[PDB]
Design a protein around this ligand. Sequence first.
Ligand code: RET
Ligand code: LFA
Ligand code: HEX
Ligand code: HEX
Ligand code: KR
Ligand code: KR
Ligand code: KR
Ligand code: KR
Ligand code: KR
Ligand code: KR
Ligand code: KR
Ligand code: KR
Ligand code: KR
Ligand code: KR
Ligand code: KR
Ligand code: KR
Ligand code: KR
Ligand code: KR
Ligand code: KR
Ligand code: KR
Ligand code: KR
Ligand code: KR
Ligand code: KR
Length: 217
Amino acid sequence: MEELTYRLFMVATVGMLAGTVFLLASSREVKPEHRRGVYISALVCGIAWYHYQKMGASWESGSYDTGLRYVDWVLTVPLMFVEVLAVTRKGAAYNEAVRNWGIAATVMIGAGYYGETSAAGSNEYWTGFVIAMATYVWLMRNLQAEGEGLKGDQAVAFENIKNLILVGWIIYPLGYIAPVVGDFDAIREVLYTIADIINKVGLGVLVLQMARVQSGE
Ligand SMILES: *C/C=C(C)/C=C/C=C(C)/C=C/C1=C(C)CCCC1(C)C
Ligand SMILES: CCCCCCCCCCCCCCCCCCCC
Ligand SMILES: CCCCCC
Ligand SMILES: CCCCCC
Ligand SMILES: [Kr]
Ligand SMILES: [Kr]
Ligand SMILES: [Kr]
Ligand SMILES: [Kr]
Ligand SMILES: [Kr]
Ligand SMILES: [Kr]
Ligand SMILES: [Kr]
Ligand SMILES: [Kr]
Ligand SMILES: [Kr]
Ligand SMILES: [Kr]
Ligand SMILES: [Kr]
Ligand SMILES: [Kr]
Ligand SMILES: [Kr]
Ligand SMILES: [Kr]
Ligand SMILES: [Kr]
Ligand SMILES: [Kr]
Ligand SMILES: [Kr]
Ligand SMILES: [Kr]
Ligand SMILES: [Kr]
């Protein structure tokens, strides 16, 4: 389980670099005016690459620091919302959502950190879980209500972004509780790494598909 967890960090390290550079090279496939989302997805993949390098070395040391994962999440999740909100919003409406979602994300991730760095099953562990789950549900319900005014191909492209988030982000709370269901500490790390690859690489690809639709492809 330990050696599988290590190999998955290394697979995910190269996966995030490939995400980064695949998206940068793919930016020539779309009109300059729809490229900003692709550049941000590459920056999200790039921050993750940098932290996955650290997390792999941290795991291989025998003294894993979950701080490296949670710092990755506090930076990348708000960048991922900057992308999604830009499909449907501009001016004050964009700035207010980015502010409000950004606060919610930071509280979600901070609470998770507080609980994860407590003993599994302790009142601290559950307090963290419940406060993060509530915030998570607030974000997902906000996300579900975005894009009522989109038409045709742009509407379907955005629905694919939303469904990837609505389904892919469920893996994080499953990872968080893995260590109470069994003697499976390393399975938390496995589930988080798979989620990060699906969610960062998957979102990169769907943001690219959106940039192609908006370019009239
Ligand atoms: C690129 C990284 C992403 C999208 C990471 C997302 C992380 C979460 C959505 C975490 C959510 C959590 C809960 C809802 C409950 C337990 C605590 C967390 C932080 C694992
Ligand atoms: C044309 C614009 C392209 C932007 C994306 C380029 C890809 C990013 C390169 C890697 C980023 C790594 C950043 C390292 C610092 C992470 C934070 C450190 C604090 C723990
Ligand atoms: C419209 C911006 C809100 C400012 C917060 C008091
Ligand atoms: C309705 C979402 C809450 C689920 C708690 C495990
Ligand atoms: Kr692996
Ligand atoms: Kr992976
Ligand atoms: Kr990968
Ligand atoms: Kr990607
Ligand atoms: Kr490409
Ligand atoms: Kr964007
Ligand atoms: Kr991304
Ligand atoms: Kr987007
Ligand atoms: Kr945000
Ligand atoms: Kr809950
Ligand atoms: Kr609970
Ligand atoms: Kr969320
Ligand atoms: Kr969200
Ligand atoms: Kr899932
Ligand atoms: Kr799963
Ligand atoms: Kr498990
Ligand atoms: Kr992993
Ligand atoms: Kr994966
Ligand atoms: Kr998977």
